[PDB]
Write a protein that binds this ligand. Structure first.
Ligand SMILES: *P(=O)(O)OCC(C)(C)[C@@H](O)C(=O)NCCC(=O)NCCS
Length: 83
């Protein structure tokens, strides 16, 4: 009808989080590359895993985190509604 509500996106919330864990001179994460392509070491993948646990109530293995991109990880987190 005349009223509408757009809502927030999980891909943005994980994107701006992962942009805080890239160890290279990169200023932001590229969505078409993996966390292993950004070169994120196990310590920072475990810090990302803990932040995702606190923010979404979800936990994922380092073997998935290294092989996955930002949209692929966001699709696993977005598998149930929270709003
Ligand atoms: P990364 O997985 O290369 O780990 C580097 C480390 C400095 C944290 C090192 O102490 C280590 O090998 N820890 C064990 C990491 C682990 O068990 N990961 C889960 C399987 S990918």
């Amino acid at each position: 009808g005349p009223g509408s509500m757009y809502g927030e996106a999980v891909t943005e919330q994980l994107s701006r989080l992962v942009a805080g864990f890239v160890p290279d001179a990169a200023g932001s994460v590229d969505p078409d590359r993996t966390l292993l392509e950004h070169g994120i070491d196990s310590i920072n993948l475990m810090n990302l895993r803990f932040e995702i646990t606190e923010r979404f109530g979800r936990t994922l293995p380092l073997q998935l985190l290294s092989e996955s991109t930002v949209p692929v990880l966001a699709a696993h987190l977005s598998a149930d509604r929270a709003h």
